[PDB]
Amino acid sequence: DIIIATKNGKVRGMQLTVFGGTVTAFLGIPYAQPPLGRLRFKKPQSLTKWSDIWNATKYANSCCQNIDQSFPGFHGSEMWNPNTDLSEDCLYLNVWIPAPKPKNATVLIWIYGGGFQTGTSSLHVYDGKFLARVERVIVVSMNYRVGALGFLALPGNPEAPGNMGLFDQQLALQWVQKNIAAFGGNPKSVTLFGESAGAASVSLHLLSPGSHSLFTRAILQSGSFNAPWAVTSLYEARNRTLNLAKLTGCSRENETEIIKCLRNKDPQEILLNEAFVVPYGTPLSVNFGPTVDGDFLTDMPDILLELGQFKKTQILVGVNKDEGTAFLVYGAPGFSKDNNSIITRKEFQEGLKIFFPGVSEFGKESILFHYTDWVDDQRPENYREALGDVVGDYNFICPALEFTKKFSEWGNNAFFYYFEHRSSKLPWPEWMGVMHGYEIEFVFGLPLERRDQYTKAEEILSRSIVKRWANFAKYGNPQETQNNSTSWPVFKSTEQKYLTLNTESTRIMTKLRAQQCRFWTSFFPKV
Numbered sequence: 001d002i003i004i005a006t007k008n009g010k011v012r013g014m015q016l017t018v019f020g021g022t023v024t025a026f027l028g029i030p031y032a033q034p035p036l037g038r039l040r041f042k043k044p045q046s047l048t049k050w051s052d053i054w055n056a057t058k059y060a061n062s063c064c065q066n067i068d069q070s071f072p073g074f075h076g077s078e079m080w081n082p083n084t085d086l087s088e089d090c091l092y093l094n095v096w097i098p099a100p101k102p103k104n105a106t107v108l109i110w111i112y113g114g115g116f117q118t119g120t121s122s123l124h125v126y127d128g129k130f131l132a133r134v135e136r137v138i139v140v141s142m143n144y145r146v147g148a149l150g151f152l153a154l155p156g157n158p159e160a161p162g163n164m165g166l167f168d169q170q171l172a173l174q175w176v177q178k179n180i181a182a183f184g185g186n187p188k189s190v191t192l193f194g195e196s197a198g199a200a201s202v203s204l205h206l207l208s209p210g211s212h213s214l215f216t217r218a219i220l221q222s223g224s225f226n227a228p229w230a231v232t233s234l235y236e237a238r239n240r241t242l243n244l245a246k247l248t249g250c251s252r253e254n255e256t257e258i259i260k261c262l263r264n265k266d267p268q269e270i271l272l273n274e275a276f277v278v279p280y281g282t283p284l285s286v287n288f289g290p291t292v293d294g295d296f297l298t299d300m301p302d303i304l305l306e307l308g309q310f311k312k313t314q315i316l317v318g319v320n321k322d323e324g325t326a327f328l329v330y331g332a333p334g335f336s337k338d339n340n341s342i343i344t345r346k347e348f349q350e351g352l353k354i355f356f357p358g359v360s361e362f363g364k365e366s367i368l369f370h371y372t373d374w375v376d377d378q379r380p381e382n383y384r385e386a387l388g389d390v391v392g393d394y395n396f397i398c399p400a401l402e403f404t405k406k407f408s409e410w411g412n413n414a415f416f417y418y419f420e421h422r423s424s425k426l427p428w429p430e431w432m433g434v435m436h437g438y439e440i441e442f443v444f445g446l447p448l449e450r451r452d453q454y455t456k457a458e459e460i461l462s463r464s465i466v467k468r469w470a471n472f473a474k475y476g477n478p479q480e481t482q483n484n485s486t487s488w489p490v491f492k493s494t495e496q497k498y499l500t501l502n503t504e505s506t507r508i509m510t511k512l513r514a515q516q517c518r519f520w521t522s523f524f525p526k527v
């Protein structure tokens, strides 16, 4: 039997055999009072002590959320869908520790993406047993509230102050601080890592004074707070909270009464109205996400970044070669996962309307002008490739690069990667390339399991990535020192060196998407 005593009480785990070894999993440990009843939309309350033991032997409830129903039965989309019961009672976390119990282990804390609207820690691609086994780090991941239940904002008013889901994450980092030493973890060596909204979450913890002392280093996969989908303004969070109230018939005059009304609704009624709090949406709509609450976030984060107001430490940042492709089949005319999606100039233009609904005629045209000046000729996939690049560059790549330059300008070592490998098992079609979210299985070490139909070259690549991530967490330096590897250089501004990740040749390059990103971060914010 394997029992650990934590501040709030005893917890029992279970033994897992991985790679001829053993890993101890503590799945579903509670870290806050369930935010039910009068607690909905509030910050998370600390947990009530318990006698007896807590059986942490299965993944807990996932947080209430709408599910992707565009491709029922298709693994490509359903692998991201929640794999545990949905419930408002969902504030739990997981711990994987190597066996035997480590002495002073570096800790990796995972934060999932999901556009702040979806996600759960219990996904197969976030299984931390491989990392614990192979690198002897301890892996932690938590569930946190998403959508309106987690980001509904009536700013000021503590009944629904905004950013609750970010505070869920923060209370969990706190739990690691007070508890991880009992699991053989080193609270002084904690690395946050996350992807998409997870990565943008990590970036926000870098700015939040309440998070400063709760971690050491940070890894941001395909995401940062300066991404255009990442932070809702005070003015439009307001319109959204109100619109949600009208739709749900909770429009009151006393703001606190509106919240009280919203508290006596079935989550389904709130989930089903979330999508219409906006006049026109995009496949990348974040209807309820982070705001400037004056608490977790004390000012507009672009200002804090620009002015050096963040945790001074090392960061590891990167993106995938075809970030934008994933989103083209959730709306763009002429696009399908089931054919090669050769679209026309008119389908491209219509495609911008989908992705940039609120921008001017001139704005959509400026994008067209920048991305359609090509050569030879008359290449049928021109418009197809270009639209994917538009969405990728604007939503992910350029803000990640920009974040990194700005962060590095204040003295800290930063490391940038460009993930170029399309998985051998990718269920999506070839034209969609190296998709958003498909580096994760490599980071978490799935290809190490050689019964899982990955090629050997993928096993090797994953092993190197796992080693780089682990060395970054342990030592702030994402090198692989033992197997004649390419050194990964710091990303300085001006020089802007980055490292390519692929199965064949690993290369140092400079100035990723220079021309494109010049268009986005300099010209485009003016339109």
Ligand SMILES: *[C@@H]1O[C@H](CO)[C@@H](O)[C@H](O)[C@H]1NC(C)=O
Binding pocket: 103, 104, 186, 188, 189
């Ligand atoms: C673990 O490591 C830290 C250094 O980061 C040290 O301060 C702490 O005392 C160590 N605790 C032990 C002995 O496990």
Ligand SMILES: *[C@@H]1O[C@H](CO)[C@@H](O)[C@H](O)[C@H]1NC(C)=O
Binding pocket: 254, 255, 256, 257
């Ligand atoms: C609104 O109602 C709440 C709950 O009864 C009360 O606490 C608050 O003081 C009221 N505020 C206003 C502006 O009437």
Ligand SMILES: *P(=O)(O)Oc1ccccc1C
Binding pocket: 113, 114, 115, 116, 196, 197, 229, 283, 284, 285, 286, 437
């Ligand atoms: P992530 O996979 O969470 O991608 C989304 C989805 C919806 C909205 C925004 C974003 C970044």
Ligand SMILES: [Cl-]
Binding pocket: 043
């Ligand atoms: Cl509080």
